[PDB]
Design a binder for this molecule. Structure first.
Ligand SMILES: *c1c(C)c(O)c2ccccc2c1O
Ligand SMILES: *c1c(C)c(O)c2ccccc2c1O
Lengths: 100, 99
């Protein structure tokens, strides 16, 4: 509980990760990504995007299912843990806006 | 609304910081003397406690107050921003607990 939180923070602390599960929760229409726009533009290399998605996946936030190689089509759908984490996020997100 | 959250989390990702914040939330007037914290957190070296407190200070989450009740007191208080944060953390605690 202690180092789970400290670690989750630390993940959240790193840059994309916070923004990514915003998308997964919000921009999704069926709680899956399918790499759409392979992200919406933004300042980020998919070298480092790919890195972050991996981090999410390792922390069971996200799961990936390769639908079809023959061409390769990849989802990136969010888990319960992830969904929940996004749900827990909302108050600190709100707070962040008050102080900025 | 963005990397302020990233920045905040980054601080929270640090070794004692989240705990210190939680402690203070749970302390009366959201305020603890240095040595209260030091014993209460078992394992923190007071080098560290200071360093951490400075960080959260710099962040504007904690205020250090010198009370000139001289025999002295030094207290660390949670700022409205800090207190508000602590509140904000609670769903995340809950989440972690569930897993
Ligand atoms: C460890 C523990 C045991 C608790 O209770 C919290 C609460 C809030 C933020 C961070 C914590 C850590 O790291
Ligand atoms: C930046 C933005 C714009 C948003 O929406 C979130 C949401 C949740 C965690 C972190 C975020 C960051 O850093």
């Amino acid at each position: 509980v202690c180092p789970y939180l400290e670690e989750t923070f630390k993940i959240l602390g790193r840059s994309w990760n916070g923004l990514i599960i915003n998308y997964l929760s919000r921009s999704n229409d069926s709680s899956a990504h399918f790499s759409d726009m392979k992200r919406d533009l933004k300042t980020i290399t998919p070298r480092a995007l790919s890195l972050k998605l991996s981090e999410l996946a390792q922390w069971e936030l996200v799961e990936k299912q390769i639908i079809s190689t023959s061409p390769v089509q990849i989802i990136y759908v969010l888990t319960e843990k992830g969904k929940a984490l996004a749900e827990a996020l909302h108050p600190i997100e709100a707070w962040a806006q008050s102080y900025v």
